[PDB]
Amino acid sequence: ASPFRLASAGEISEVQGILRTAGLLGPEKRIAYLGVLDPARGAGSEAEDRRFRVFIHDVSGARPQEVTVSVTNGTVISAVELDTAATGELPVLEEEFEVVEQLLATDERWLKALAARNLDVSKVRVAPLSAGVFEYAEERGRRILRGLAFVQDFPEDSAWAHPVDGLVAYVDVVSKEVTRVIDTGVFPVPAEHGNYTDPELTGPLRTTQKPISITQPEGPSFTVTGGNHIEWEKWSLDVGFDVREGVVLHNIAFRDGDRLRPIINRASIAEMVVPYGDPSPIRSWQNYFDTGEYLVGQYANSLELGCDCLGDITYLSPVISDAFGNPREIRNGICMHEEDWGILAKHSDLWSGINYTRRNRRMVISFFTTIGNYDYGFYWYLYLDGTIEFEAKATGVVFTSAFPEGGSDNISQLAPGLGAPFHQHIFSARLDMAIDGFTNRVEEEDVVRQTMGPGNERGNAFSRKRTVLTRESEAVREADARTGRTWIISNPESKNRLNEPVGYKLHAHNQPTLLADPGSSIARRAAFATKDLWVTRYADDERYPTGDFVNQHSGGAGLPSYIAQDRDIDGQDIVVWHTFGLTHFPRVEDWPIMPVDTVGFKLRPEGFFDRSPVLDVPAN
Amino acid sequence: ASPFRLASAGEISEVQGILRTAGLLGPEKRIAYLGVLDPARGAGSEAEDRRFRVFIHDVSGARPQEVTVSVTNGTVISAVELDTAATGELPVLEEEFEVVEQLLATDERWLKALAARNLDVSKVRVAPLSAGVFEYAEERGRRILRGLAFVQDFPEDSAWAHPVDGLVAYVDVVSKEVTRVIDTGVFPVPAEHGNYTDPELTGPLRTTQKPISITQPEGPSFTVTGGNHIEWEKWSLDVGFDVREGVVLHNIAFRDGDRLRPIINRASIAEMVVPYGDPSPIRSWQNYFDTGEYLVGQYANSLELGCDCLGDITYLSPVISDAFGNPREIRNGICMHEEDWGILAKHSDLWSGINYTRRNRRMVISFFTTIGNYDYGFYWYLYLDGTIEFEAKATGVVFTSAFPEGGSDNISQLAPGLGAPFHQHIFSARLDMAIDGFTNRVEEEDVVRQTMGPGNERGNAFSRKRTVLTRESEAVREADARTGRTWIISNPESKNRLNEPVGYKLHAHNQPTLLADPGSSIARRAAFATKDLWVTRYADDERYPTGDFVNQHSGGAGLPSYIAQDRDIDGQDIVVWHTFGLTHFPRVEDWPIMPVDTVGFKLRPEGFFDRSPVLDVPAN
Ligand SMILES: [Co+2]
Ligand SMILES: [Co+2]
């Protein structure tokens, strides 16, 4: 009954029917993206109108279409033909992942290159990589995929151990033509295997790890109603799932006594890019927008009990559409559970003789996705004290190359002859703010050092300053770890008992942002990644920091364009977009398989409550 | 047995006996500090020589003494009389704490000040605080404590809710004289109570929290041998405990195949300072060196099972000396256990069809201390992948003041009329490095951005640069979050299989360092806190960043003086001193009792291993 419920198999079947009927679905059509639309803030419309947005590709070569259907009324609300050269190509179809290797296998230029390296073509795997936009004029308007080769000695062999450097191919996946084969030179193909399940590599497994049992004899403290509505320790929210963004959080609110107070209207990771810093032409075009170009939600893993999610787990199995409009369920794709989080508050008072100790807990909502060589875990945490946090865990197998003789300023050696090009994993968290409602503003808070002199004779004083961001043209901010810079989102019309606008403070990790030269294509295509914080006026069509069609889009889409509107954000319905990421110079320890590396951010109440919101937690 | 075992009750009684026998511990003498000394460098000496260092105070006013005794040989190695005005006063004695309130209770200037505020002296608690070094010439050479008053309405009342502003007194605790009583004017004493156990404030307690049971059916995976020697998942180390530093980690090593490889010889929190930023003369002198002045270890709490340490816990009960040289045990003062830590590594490979997932875990060694209104937890973590991490958890009750009528740039409001002056909690981790042995060096690593042009035509290249710190003169470094600055400690004579020096990378949180004006007393006394990283050449008498005697001691000792030696640190026995802390602007959510805030740092292997060290980890 909730308009925020997860899409049903039936709704997806219904979208397929509606499309078929309107002639929008046929033999050469493929659904590149399908997802339910969020309500448009105005529940006075009553009843219910579940709309779905669909990106439709044409395998023949016809122009793709963006269509919005209404499943409640069984109608097509809109259907527009897209000029991809103008607005960008559609998301890479999973069924195109095989195409690059197949087309190359019969290409004489490709075969020539493999022959010179004495590589058996039936053993050469080709990775279907996004192309981006560079100097290839003939690529505009065409759906191109690039391929890098890796040798797979046998079926269960890890091909990443055997990159074939000095060679790269470009393929038009619609016309099915290999547009180009570049061979800069032969590089020895690294010989050592990276088979982490091979006992010759692992060695005898440890027998020292004793069991750790995490159990809840009375069940979890959270309740799930309406399929995806969670209620836990004063928190209330709806767990959504979109094929592009993955787990999305809706209506995050906290029941402060009598009122259910909203905090964040919608929380999601709206983009996730992996730019490479190897200037070799074989890889210099490499930039994977895992969310925008590949769609991380579709590759979500089915999480095994005990192994991926330990303790008392409650699962959600979201349903998505396949290339033909048929619903596909991602069994056990989302984990929900609460975990102990050490000490919450503690004080042993001499004067009162009272010794007080309370334990903390966090509600966890997570999913794990696989995009080629990388695997990422997305974790959302809600704490007892009102803190909200996001954490991304990056693992998988590093993307390899050959390690140049003479070394490299842009690649690190992992094994003999094996290299790992430098890269970053940069995320964008889109936070549609609702601090006690939609009338919000953001202030940049810096610590302020003071000079010893009149009024500060001992030179011990230090303060803080807050600068309200009033217009979008002033809402593109950078980090300043040195002055403890943070950003506070408040409601200027909702004050706490001390008469101060209630608020929440965003604590960033202050990791480096996009390193690429400002004039590079990736800098223009992923401009969101060049700054730590952006603030925009809400707009239902401004969903991604990189725009709706990221694949081969020329640049400037998303945030730089939205920000150009210079709308009033001082006490308005606003959205915070936080850029955060990892900068990787892979180590030997990252080979053969990478141990988890993490990054994230969190928001803590800043005068939101009238006192500590955790005084009612029992000693237990 | 092992020269790193914890001090036993017998050794402490024996030190007392040896001091008594030597005429160094008569009736007027008090032990202000007693601790076991680490074995000397190069155990070429036959057998064990357990040495104890002692700071002896004289209650009659005679000069104190620093003494080292050999408990093994029953001898006094050295005994020197100290000139406190020059070298610093001894740490504050627990017995001197109560003296301030007692003396003030009969001082007429104090009584007059209380009468002016209509406060009953029998209800006015006085917080005995370290004095620091300011313009009071008569304090040089004397043991002074300053007092700030808080009203306690009834025995179980939290006095912190009722600060008495405009008043401060200075007391000589040896001659027992009130040297000064300053009253700048009456301020309303905040009225609301801060009784977090009062059902009137808490409201009905939650009944929603279901149990989370964490058990280990077969016991823990780590072994405790020789009282404090731990072996866990390839890690090896000794858990020591010092009254000043608290938990100290010795000989941290990792068993890589056949060889036990040293990583860190000694790890401890060598100092922690809490500077206040309110320029009011009532508090502008306020700076607590919890470790150096108070000795955090002596105030360690006895940890309760289930409350403080959940799971299968193995406790250590360290023994310390009382003021008379008699042994005193801190029952269950240290918790040791291992905890599940999510996913270690994961990858679902399309090409091979192999899906691989491994769970992580960490060894935890912690203790919690209480110094007046603050309570701090010190946590050391050892992970499966070779990562070492420290985390400080700050909770307790906020130090209060009155909230000025017309607001404040240095104090925030917590409740009506109740203020919380701005302050910081800054720690100094002393890491005596032994990366594969003692021949080590440190390099500062910065991410390097590259300009688009020749050799980087697409403007996508990015690199890194490492600068070796060769002499102590150039080893005082600051954070640079923007360029991803880290510091790598390597052994230039021990190379991995790829012929690169093995190393460990230090990742700092890059929080603001000391904010006080560089010309302030605190900037000079806590000079270590003004920079993020210092590297010194090891010396057995360079133990704390602030020197042996911090109490009422000016600048002249500690890190700035050691560094002046400008010793060779390029491939030598070196020590890394990392400054990291929290900058606090108290929020309403921090009142009446503060929820835990955290800060720390970690070190990750950087080419130390020849490949991932966790390939032998089984299913889990
Ligand atoms: Co990476
Ligand atoms: Co604090």
Short mmCIF file of N, CA and C in Angstrom, two decimals, chain B residues 496-593:
data_model
loop_
_atom_site.label_atom_id
_atom_site.label_comp_id
_atom_site.label_asym_id
_atom_site.label_seq_id
_atom_site.Cartn_x
_atom_site.Cartn_y
_atom_site.Cartn_z
N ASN B 496 61.24 -7.27 -0.55
CA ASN B 496 60.28 -8.32 -0.86
C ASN B 496 60.78 -9.04 -2.12
N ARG B 497 60.03 -10.05 -2.56
CA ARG B 497 60.41 -10.82 -3.74
C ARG B 497 60.50 -9.99 -5.01
N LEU B 498 59.91 -8.80 -5.02
CA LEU B 498 59.96 -7.96 -6.20
C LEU B 498 61.09 -6.95 -6.10
N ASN B 499 61.98 -7.21 -5.15
CA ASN B 499 63.15 -6.37 -4.89
C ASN B 499 62.89 -4.95 -4.40
N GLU B 500 61.81 -4.77 -3.63
CA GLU B 500 61.47 -3.47 -3.07
C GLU B 500 61.54 -3.54 -1.54
N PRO B 501 62.06 -2.48 -0.88
CA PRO B 501 62.15 -2.47 0.59
C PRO B 501 60.77 -2.69 1.18
N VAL B 502 60.67 -3.61 2.15
CA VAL B 502 59.42 -3.89 2.82
C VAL B 502 59.03 -2.64 3.61
N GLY B 503 57.72 -2.42 3.79
CA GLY B 503 57.27 -1.24 4.51
C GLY B 503 55.85 -1.32 5.03
N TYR B 504 55.47 -0.31 5.81
CA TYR B 504 54.13 -0.17 6.39
C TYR B 504 53.78 1.30 6.20
N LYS B 505 52.53 1.54 5.82
CA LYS B 505 52.06 2.90 5.56
C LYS B 505 51.14 3.40 6.66
N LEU B 506 51.45 4.58 7.18
CA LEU B 506 50.65 5.18 8.24
C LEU B 506 49.58 6.09 7.64
N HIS B 507 48.32 5.76 7.93
CA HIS B 507 47.19 6.55 7.46
C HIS B 507 46.63 7.32 8.65
N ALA B 508 46.78 8.64 8.60
CA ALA B 508 46.29 9.55 9.64
C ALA B 508 44.89 10.03 9.25
N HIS B 509 44.10 10.45 10.24
CA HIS B 509 42.75 10.94 9.98
C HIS B 509 42.74 12.38 9.54
N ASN B 510 43.89 13.04 9.67
CA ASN B 510 44.08 14.43 9.29
C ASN B 510 43.15 15.44 9.98
N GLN B 511 42.93 15.23 11.28
CA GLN B 511 42.11 16.13 12.09
C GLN B 511 42.95 17.35 12.42
N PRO B 512 42.32 18.49 12.77
CA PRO B 512 43.10 19.68 13.10
C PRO B 512 44.02 19.40 14.29
N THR B 513 45.20 20.00 14.26
CA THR B 513 46.16 19.81 15.34
C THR B 513 45.96 20.97 16.35
N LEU B 514 46.90 21.21 17.26
CA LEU B 514 46.74 22.28 18.26
C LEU B 514 46.39 23.64 17.66
N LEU B 515 45.24 24.18 18.08
CA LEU B 515 44.73 25.46 17.59
C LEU B 515 45.28 26.71 18.28
N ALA B 516 45.73 26.55 19.53
CA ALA B 516 46.27 27.68 20.31
C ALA B 516 47.32 28.50 19.57
N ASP B 517 47.36 29.79 19.85
CA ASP B 517 48.33 30.69 19.24
C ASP B 517 49.72 30.11 19.53
N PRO B 518 50.64 30.14 18.54
CA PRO B 518 52.01 29.61 18.72
C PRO B 518 52.81 30.22 19.88
N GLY B 519 52.39 31.40 20.34
CA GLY B 519 53.08 32.06 21.44
C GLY B 519 52.50 31.76 22.81
N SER B 520 51.49 30.90 22.87
CA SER B 520 50.86 30.56 24.13
C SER B 520 51.70 29.59 24.95
N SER B 521 51.38 29.50 26.24
CA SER B 521 52.07 28.59 27.13
C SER B 521 51.82 27.15 26.66
N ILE B 522 50.56 26.84 26.36
CA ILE B 522 50.21 25.50 25.90
C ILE B 522 50.90 25.12 24.59
N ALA B 523 51.11 26.06 23.67
CA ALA B 523 51.79 25.73 22.42
C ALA B 523 53.22 25.29 22.73
N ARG B 524 53.83 25.91 23.74
CA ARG B 524 55.17 25.54 24.11
C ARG B 524 55.23 24.26 24.94
N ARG B 525 54.28 24.09 25.85
CA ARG B 525 54.25 22.90 26.70
C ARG B 525 53.76 21.66 25.93
N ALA B 526 52.87 21.88 24.96
CA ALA B 526 52.34 20.78 24.15
C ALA B 526 52.80 20.99 22.70
N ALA B 527 54.07 21.33 22.52
CA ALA B 527 54.63 21.57 21.19
C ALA B 527 54.42 20.39 20.22
N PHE B 528 54.44 19.17 20.74
CA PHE B 528 54.24 17.98 19.93
C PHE B 528 52.89 18.02 19.20
N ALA B 529 51.90 18.65 19.84
CA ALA B 529 50.54 18.72 19.32
C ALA B 529 50.34 19.67 18.15
N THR B 530 51.36 20.46 17.83
CA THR B 530 51.29 21.41 16.74
C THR B 530 51.63 20.81 15.37
N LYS B 531 52.16 19.59 15.36
CA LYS B 531 52.54 18.91 14.12
C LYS B 531 52.02 17.50 14.15
N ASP B 532 51.68 16.98 12.97
CA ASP B 532 51.11 15.64 12.84
C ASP B 532 52.08 14.48 12.99
N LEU B 533 53.33 14.66 12.57
CA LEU B 533 54.29 13.57 12.64
C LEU B 533 55.72 14.02 12.93
N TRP B 534 56.38 13.31 13.85
CA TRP B 534 57.77 13.60 14.22
C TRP B 534 58.49 12.27 14.15
N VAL B 535 59.76 12.29 13.75
CA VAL B 535 60.57 11.07 13.72
C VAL B 535 61.87 11.38 14.46
N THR B 536 62.19 10.56 15.44
CA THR B 536 63.41 10.74 16.20
C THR B 536 64.26 9.47 16.12
N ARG B 537 65.52 9.62 16.49
CA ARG B 537 66.45 8.51 16.56
C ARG B 537 66.20 7.95 17.98
N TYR B 538 66.03 6.65 18.10
CA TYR B 538 65.75 6.05 19.39
C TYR B 538 66.81 6.38 20.44
N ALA B 539 66.35 6.64 21.66
CA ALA B 539 67.21 6.94 22.82
C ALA B 539 66.41 6.44 24.01
N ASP B 540 67.06 5.74 24.94
CA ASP B 540 66.32 5.21 26.08
C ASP B 540 65.71 6.22 27.06
N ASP B 541 66.11 7.48 26.95
CA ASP B 541 65.57 8.50 27.84
C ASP B 541 64.62 9.45 27.12
N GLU B 542 64.24 9.11 25.89
CA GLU B 542 63.32 9.94 25.12
C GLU B 542 62.03 9.14 25.08
N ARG B 543 61.28 9.24 26.16
CA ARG B 543 60.06 8.47 26.33
C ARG B 543 58.73 9.15 26.02
N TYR B 544 58.63 10.42 26.36
CA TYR B 544 57.39 11.16 26.19
C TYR B 544 57.66 12.39 25.38
N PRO B 545 56.68 12.80 24.57
CA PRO B 545 56.83 13.99 23.73
C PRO B 545 56.93 15.29 24.52
N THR B 546 56.54 15.22 25.79
CA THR B 546 56.51 16.34 26.72
C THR B 546 57.58 16.23 27.84
N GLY B 547 58.40 15.19 27.80
CA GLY B 547 59.42 15.02 28.82
C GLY B 547 58.90 14.20 29.98
N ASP B 548 59.79 13.95 30.94
CA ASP B 548 59.45 13.16 32.11
C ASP B 548 58.55 13.89 33.09
N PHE B 549 58.72 15.20 33.18
CA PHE B 549 57.94 15.99 34.16
C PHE B 549 57.16 17.10 33.48
N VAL B 550 55.87 16.85 33.27
CA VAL B 550 55.00 17.81 32.59
C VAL B 550 54.32 18.81 33.55
N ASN B 551 53.92 18.33 34.72
CA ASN B 551 53.23 19.15 35.73
C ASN B 551 53.97 20.45 36.01
N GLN B 552 53.30 21.57 35.71
CA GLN B 552 53.83 22.91 35.92
C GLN B 552 55.22 23.11 35.33
N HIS B 553 55.48 22.43 34.23
CA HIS B 553 56.77 22.55 33.59
C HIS B 553 56.64 23.32 32.30
N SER B 554 57.49 24.32 32.10
CA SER B 554 57.47 25.13 30.88
C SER B 554 58.07 24.34 29.68
N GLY B 555 58.27 25.01 28.55
CA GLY B 555 58.89 24.35 27.41
C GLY B 555 60.38 24.18 27.73
N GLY B 556 61.09 23.34 26.98
CA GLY B 556 62.51 23.12 27.24
C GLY B 556 62.88 21.64 27.22
N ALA B 557 61.89 20.78 27.36
CA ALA B 557 62.13 19.35 27.32
C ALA B 557 61.28 18.78 26.17
N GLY B 558 61.15 17.46 26.11
CA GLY B 558 60.35 16.81 25.08
C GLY B 558 60.86 16.83 23.65
N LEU B 559 59.97 16.56 22.69
CA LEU B 559 60.30 16.49 21.26
C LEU B 559 61.12 17.62 20.64
N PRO B 560 60.77 18.90 20.91
CA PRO B 560 61.59 19.95 20.30
C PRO B 560 63.08 19.91 20.68
N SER B 561 63.39 19.45 21.89
CA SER B 561 64.78 19.37 22.32
C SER B 561 65.47 18.12 21.74
N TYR B 562 64.74 17.00 21.65
CA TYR B 562 65.30 15.76 21.09
C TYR B 562 65.71 15.99 19.62
N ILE B 563 64.77 16.54 18.87
CA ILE B 563 64.90 16.85 17.45
C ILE B 563 66.13 17.70 17.15
N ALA B 564 66.47 18.60 18.07
CA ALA B 564 67.63 19.48 17.90
C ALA B 564 68.94 18.71 17.72
N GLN B 565 68.97 17.47 18.18
CA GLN B 565 70.17 16.65 18.05
C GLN B 565 70.47 16.35 16.59
N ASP B 566 69.45 16.49 15.75
CA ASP B 566 69.58 16.28 14.31
C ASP B 566 70.31 14.99 13.94
N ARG B 567 69.88 13.89 14.55
CA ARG B 567 70.48 12.59 14.33
C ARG B 567 70.05 11.93 13.01
N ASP B 568 70.85 10.97 12.57
CA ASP B 568 70.59 10.25 11.33
C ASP B 568 69.43 9.29 11.55
N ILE B 569 68.39 9.43 10.73
CA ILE B 569 67.21 8.57 10.83
C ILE B 569 66.97 7.78 9.54
N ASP B 570 67.92 7.88 8.62
CA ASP B 570 67.83 7.19 7.35
C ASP B 570 68.41 5.79 7.47
N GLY B 571 67.59 4.81 7.85
CA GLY B 571 68.07 3.45 7.99
C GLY B 571 68.73 3.26 9.35
N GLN B 572 68.03 3.67 10.40
CA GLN B 572 68.54 3.58 11.77
C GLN B 572 67.40 3.15 12.67
N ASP B 573 67.69 3.02 13.96
CA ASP B 573 66.70 2.64 14.96
C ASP B 573 65.91 3.94 15.20
N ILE B 574 64.68 4.01 14.69
CA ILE B 574 63.86 5.20 14.79
C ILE B 574 62.51 5.05 15.49
N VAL B 575 61.93 6.19 15.84
CA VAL B 575 60.66 6.23 16.54
C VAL B 575 59.76 7.26 15.87
N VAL B 576 58.51 6.87 15.64
CA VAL B 576 57.54 7.76 15.01
C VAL B 576 56.57 8.25 16.07
N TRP B 577 56.34 9.55 16.12
CA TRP B 577 55.43 10.14 17.10
C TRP B 577 54.30 10.80 16.31
N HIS B 578 53.12 10.19 16.36
CA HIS B 578 51.97 10.71 15.62
C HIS B 578 50.94 11.43 16.51
N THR B 579 50.70 12.69 16.18
CA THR B 579 49.73 13.56 16.85
C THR B 579 48.38 13.44 16.12
N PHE B 580 47.32 13.14 16.86
CA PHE B 580 45.97 13.03 16.30
C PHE B 580 44.95 13.38 17.38
N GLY B 581 43.92 14.13 17.02
CA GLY B 581 42.93 14.46 18.03
C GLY B 581 41.57 14.93 17.57
N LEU B 582 40.72 15.21 18.55
CA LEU B 582 39.35 15.68 18.35
C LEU B 582 39.21 17.15 18.74
N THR B 583 38.51 17.93 17.91
CA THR B 583 38.26 19.34 18.19
C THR B 583 36.76 19.36 18.51
N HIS B 584 36.44 19.73 19.75
CA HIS B 584 35.06 19.75 20.21
C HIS B 584 34.36 21.08 20.44
N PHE B 585 33.17 21.21 19.84
CA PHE B 585 32.27 22.37 19.97
C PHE B 585 31.06 21.59 20.48
N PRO B 586 30.94 21.41 21.80
CA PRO B 586 29.82 20.64 22.33
C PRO B 586 28.42 21.01 21.83
N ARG B 587 27.63 19.97 21.60
CA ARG B 587 26.28 20.10 21.09
C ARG B 587 25.33 19.77 22.22
N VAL B 588 24.06 20.14 22.04
CA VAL B 588 23.01 19.82 23.00
C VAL B 588 22.94 18.30 23.15
N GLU B 589 23.23 17.57 22.07
CA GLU B 589 23.21 16.10 22.12
C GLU B 589 24.29 15.50 23.04
N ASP B 590 25.25 16.33 23.43
CA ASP B 590 26.32 15.89 24.31
C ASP B 590 25.91 15.96 25.78
N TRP B 591 24.77 16.59 26.05
CA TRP B 591 24.25 16.79 27.41
C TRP B 591 23.01 15.90 27.66
N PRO B 592 22.84 15.32 28.87
CA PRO B 592 23.64 15.35 30.11
C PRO B 592 24.88 14.44 30.17
N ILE B 593 24.96 13.47 29.26
CA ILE B 593 26.11 12.57 29.19
C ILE B 593 26.44 12.38 27.69
#
